[PDB]
Amino acid sequence: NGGVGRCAQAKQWKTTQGRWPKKSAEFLLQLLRNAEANADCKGLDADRLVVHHIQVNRAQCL
Amino acid sequence: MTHIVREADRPGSKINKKEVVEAVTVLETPPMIVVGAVGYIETPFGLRALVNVWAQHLSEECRRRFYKNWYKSKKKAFTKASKKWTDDLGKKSIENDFRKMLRYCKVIRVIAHSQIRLIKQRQKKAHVMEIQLNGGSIEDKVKWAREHLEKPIQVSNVFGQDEMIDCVGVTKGKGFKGVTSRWHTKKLPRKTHKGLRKVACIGAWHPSRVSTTVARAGQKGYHHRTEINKKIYRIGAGIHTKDGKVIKNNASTEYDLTDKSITPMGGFPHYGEVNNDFVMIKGCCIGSKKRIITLRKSLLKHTKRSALEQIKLKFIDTSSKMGHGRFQTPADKLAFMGPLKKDRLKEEAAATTAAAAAATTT
Amino acid sequence: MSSLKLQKRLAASVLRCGKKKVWLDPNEINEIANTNSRQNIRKLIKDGLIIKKPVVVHSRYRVRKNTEARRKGRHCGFGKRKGTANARMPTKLLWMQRQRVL
Amino acid sequence: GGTAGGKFRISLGLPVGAVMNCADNTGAKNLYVIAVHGIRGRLNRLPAAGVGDMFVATVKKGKPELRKKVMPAVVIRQRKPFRRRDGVFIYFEDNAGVIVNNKGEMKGSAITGPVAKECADLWPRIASNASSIA
Amino acid sequence: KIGLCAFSGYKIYPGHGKTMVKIDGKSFTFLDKKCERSYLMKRNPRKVTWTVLYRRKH
Amino acid sequence: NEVVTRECTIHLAKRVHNIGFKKRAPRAIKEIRKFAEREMGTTDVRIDTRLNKHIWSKGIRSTPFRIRVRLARRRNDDEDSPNKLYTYVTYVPVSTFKNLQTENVESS
RNA sequence: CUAGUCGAUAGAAUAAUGUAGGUAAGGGAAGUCGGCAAAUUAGAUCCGUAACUUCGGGAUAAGGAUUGGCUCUGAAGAUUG
RNA sequence: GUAACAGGCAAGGUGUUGUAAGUGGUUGAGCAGCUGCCAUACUGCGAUCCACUGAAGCUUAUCCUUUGCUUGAUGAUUCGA
């Protein structure tokens, strides 16, 4: 978080800093669309779902 | 600020019995509403607020310091703890709470609104302030404050003319400035690489830190200051209809007698329209447009003969501030300039349509 | 729909005014883009779907409102003179003309 | 000295070294401000003469017996405006000075143009020889 | 007290102006800077059509 | 109703002020989009092309001090979108904006 | 104008210090190692021009005056006589 | 506050530049077509000037004022002794 700009919508998180990482959101939309799609396969009710365990890692730098 | 001629009343200066053209300031002070009474004791730590008694009804203008969102709320302060004046209370609630100031306390300060909706701003949310009473035998101070709960007090009873007021406010914000503006440091030459409006040296080798005596980029604008020894030249009282419409000796005097008002032509620019009472001090209190300057009475003695005299002012300049005033009253333009191609040559259409209105019924 | 990068380059080399001045009909780009040969694009040009977008008027009105006022000398004072007098009319070509007169 | 009452601060328009008219009828035609006559000073700051501020002068393009000497002089009018104490802001058409001994007595007998009131009030001898004060 | 603008013809309430002294000896009150500048460019006031002197040319 | 078409004047120089020249007036066509979404509530603001031709009439730098624009908030015909409404602002040529009191009555 | 491009990562906002460009009362080099940097002058027609000189120059020395717009007048030629 | 309000418009006010386009002019150097037989003439000439004209522009974007037209709530996130 250095040197990320401060804002006011990051009061709710209780940390004065934060950004709006557009394409980082939209790769996780396009994942939770695909995690929800297998939830509809087995017959899980999609509205009773919580994000239980999410993690991000590294890959081979290009 | 608005520029006053007067005739100076000194001993052997060089302006004696002569005229000077002074700069004055206008503070629109609509009457404070006093709303509650606080006592303080002494501890070996300093004073300490002990009791707090509020009046029961408070204006909706001035229960608005207690909220940061008022449109959104349910307006529930002071709804519960203002019922203490309506229960028994005569053995239990409040007469005890006024007993406590008679005995324990030493300093009784009083809480006051400001009726800021008379000022015509977009603000609509008040300013609460603790004013200390300073009249003897604090048995008096608790009865003075028990009289004037919920009742207004106006600026003519606090101050007089020819007193030395003090002004306590905030200055005007400039921003993150730099060093030849914050501290007014020299400029480095035109041959200065990497920056000339700096301080060049920032310290010695040793003490090998930087000190808090060096000039850095540390704020300009918006500091608290108190300024002493402004002198009140006039106290306005300017509203309305004592028998008929009344504005006269607001900006009038005994050498002018056109009666108008302190507000120039086209208003005070960015500042207002002033209709209410005003205190008119000497030159320059602090701040921007529409600040809350509180005026405290002077802490000190005045024996300087500049501080002591009474001056009655000759003239109050009510010409515009919005570019360069040429005339004083709006009917002073008709002394110089008569019929502009306007409602002086639009009346001659307005007179014949009213004659066509007279030709309508006939 | 499609890119008429090809379709424009063939138009400006058929009309022979380069493609600053080519107009392809912008409601008929579906039907323009199906056409690849130039013999298939003169048919779109004889028909009214590709036009040659005429030249800019660089009007000569004021140029000859002025040089009818020079004939009366309206703009030749000493503050409209910037050549040395030998440059405006070379005196070698006044004594050339004068000798040929005599 | 001789400053009667409070001579209020006016704006100084003549630093070291400016060149003033010598409105004198002595023969000097320029006066050049070497230095002004009341000045403590702070660092880097140039002394500067107001109206009725006596100073130290040389005549640069004058007479032969007034040149290459150091003499006193008094400013009688300047071109940068100055607030008089009744809201007036007077300035003049060009700057001018007057050769004076150390007492305050003039050197010549005429002053060719207006003397400001500020100069006349402190020097009564320049006041007497004046054409039109203020 | 109330003084007269020398270029135009307006009144000058106290404060409100600058005042020029030529070394003729004469003193000139102007009302604005606009009048003061426009005198030093020698715009004659009979010819500037917002004045009093142009206005007394009717 | 939600289909109303409202004709109103807009003081432009009030808005493209504080902005350096040669940045207006492609700024003045953003300030128009801010003007419509405060007057018709919608977000999809379409600007009639003739208005853009009018704004770029006096170059990038100079911009007309006041315009007389006519917004029409219509329901989004096709392309089923979140925004069911969209405002279309067209250019009205008038002579003198003086005493041109804005009004909503535009049947056409 | 003809042809040719708007491709230089885009939006918001205009703090400090900057790189680049303007203007600034009064004074005018006091600044500085030093007028560095900036400022002034500048095209054209007519006047006019100093020391010194290798007689060629110096010299655009210096120092001045003029100039827009509009409506006119005069002078300069060609083929036919 | 279904409007104690408010935003956008508009009207005033104050300013600022300095007399708008437009017709009309006995304002206009002068020159022409006809200048006429008389009446003695139009202008397509033509910088300017004048009237309508202190007009016209701009005027809060960090100016002032409202019984003028217009518009409006209709979200989101967290929190107890």
Swiss-Prot record, chain A:
Coiled coil: none annotated. Belongs to the universal ribosomal protein uL22 family. This is Large ribosomal subunit protein uL22. It comes from Drosophila melanogaster. The lineage of its organism: Eukaryota, Metazoa, Ecdysozoa, Arthropoda, Hexapoda. The chain holds residues 64 to 125 of 186 of the full protein.
UniProtKB/Swiss-Prot annotation, chain B:
Keywords: Cytoplasm, Ribonucleoprotein, Ribosomal protein. One of its GO terms (cellular component) is cytosolic ribosome. Coiled coil: none annotated. It is found in: Cytoplasm. InterPro entries: L3_arc_euk, Ribosomal_L3_dom_3_arc_sf, Ribosomal_uL3, Ribosomal_uL3_CS, Transl_B-barrel_sf. GO terms for molecular function: RNA binding; structural constituent of ribosome. GO terms for biological process: cytoplasmic translation; translation. The keyword Mitochondrion does not apply. Pfam families: Ribosomal_L3 (PF00297). Belongs to the universal ribosomal protein uL3 family. The L3 protein is a component of the large subunit of cytoplasmic ribosomes. This is Large ribosomal subunit protein uL3.
From Swiss-Prot, chain C:
GO terms for molecular function: RNA binding; structural constituent of ribosome. The keyword Protease does not apply. It comes from the Eukaryota. GO terms for cellular component: cytosolic large ribosomal subunit; cytosolic ribosome. It comes from Drosophila melanogaster (Fruit fly). This is Large ribosomal subunit protein eL19. Keywords: Ribonucleoprotein, Ribosomal protein. The chain holds residues 1 to 102 of 203 of the full protein. GO terms for biological process: cytoplasmic translation. The keyword Ribonucleoprotein applies. Belongs to the eukaryotic ribosomal protein eL19 family.
From Swiss-Prot, chain E:
Belongs to the eukaryotic ribosomal protein eL24 family. This is Large ribosomal subunit protein eL24. The chain holds residues 2 to 59 of 155 of the full protein.
